[PDB]
Design a protein around this ligand. Structure first.
Ligand code: NI
Ligand code: NI
Ligand code: NI
Ligand code: NI
Lengths: 218, 218
């Protein structure tokens, strides 16, 4: 029923990270309605396959290769949803479950067509941005500006330097997303803007602020 | 790569029968680029599953259930091709290979949408009628009129009775499709017309002729 089990585990990791939930084996098990033991065995095989690493505190860390694939699966999934909703007219309650199968069989060529054919490929019908469209191709720690890449990762805030800021509007944004020193947050450059996420709340940083906030790896 | 192997074997049986080729294990092996031994093992499992029977002369006979599924797979396959060609604009050289994956994951609901959304669902872009649209839901031997059903089957012509016919135009049609007594031909009611096929040449019978031609089971 899962069609491509490996790809489903990756897509589920992806969407847990999007939501700011720590990707743990029991959350994957719950989301895919699979047994914990079955998940643990499939996770072991994904490790052998180069797709994931189980960190010492048991969270799943997608390898850059795993992440690239997960991003591809998500992109296909969201473009299929837009197709099914925008063009096919499939009833909305069935769209995600259809795209959940289609995502494992859509080629890159179909996607490049969809990008031309659809009105807007900013987001799925369910509110989330479509990732990967670029790859389809149509002083403790480190300053956020230097540490962020085009692939998101979870890091820890070790300093904010509010004393050096002129752009003072984002202070409250950070506070309302409860981002403080010691918060573990996702970072990405996407761009020319860095974004911090905490608990699925996004803060798009101005560059003065991205120069000032310093992070450490988890 | 086959996505649903069982469904691929059925779709390949279907298309061999369409072409008037006897569905034999070596022709399936050849078409799917699978080993003979692998085909024979998968065929054994399909038998255990109720989908096919290997007749005493080694041809594959789809069970009515196998045939119903094969017809469903074909319908999904052809509607996907029309979608990919008519709406998506996928380059024609890639359409069949894409639909070859999509056919195993399209629900009935998507198909019912496609039937409304597409211009014409008479045929795939590759010239063959789309079957199953009805089930989607939007004196030796026996006279052809009595023996034919909505599901095609291979039978043997045992009598033609040309002496009793007034409609004399179809005689040559039969002759050019080399349908003579002793010819093994496919029959279907589809309708209100019976069709005889021999070697992938179709003859649509007038009812006077369908009353006259008598057939036996193989
Ligand atoms: Ni979805
Ligand atoms: Ni899926
Ligand atoms: Ni085809
Ligand atoms: Ni296929």
């Amino acid at each position: 029923d899962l069609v491509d089990t490996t790809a489903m585990y990756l897509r589920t990791i992806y969407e847990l990270e999007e939501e700011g939930v720590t990707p743990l084996r029991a959350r994957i098990a719950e989301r895919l309605e699979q047994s914990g033991p079955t998940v643990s065995q499939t996770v072991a095989r994904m490790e052998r396959d180069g797709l994931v690493v189980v960190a010492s505190d048991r969270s799943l860390q997608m390898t850059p290769t795993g992440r690239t694939l997960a991003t591809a699966v998500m992109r296909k999934h969201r473009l299929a949803e837009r197709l099914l909703t925008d063009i096919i007219g499939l009833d909305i309650n069935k769209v995600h479950d259809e795209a959940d199968r289609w995502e494992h069989v859509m080629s890159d060529e179909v996607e490049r067509r969809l990008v031309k054919v659809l009105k807007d490929v900013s987001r799925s019908p369910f509110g989330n941005p479509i990732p990967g469209l670029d790859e389809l191709g149509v002083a403790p720690g480190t300053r956020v500006i230097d540490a962020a890449t085009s692939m998101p990762r979870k890091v820890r805030i070790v300093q904010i330097n509010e004393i050096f800021q002129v752009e003072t509007d984002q202070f409250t944004q950070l506070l309302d997303a409860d981002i403080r020193v010691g918060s573990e947050v996702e970072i990405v450059d996407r761009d020319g803007h860095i974004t911090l996420s905490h608990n699925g709340k996004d803060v798009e940083l101005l560059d003065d602020l991205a120069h000032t906030i310093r992070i450490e790896e988890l």
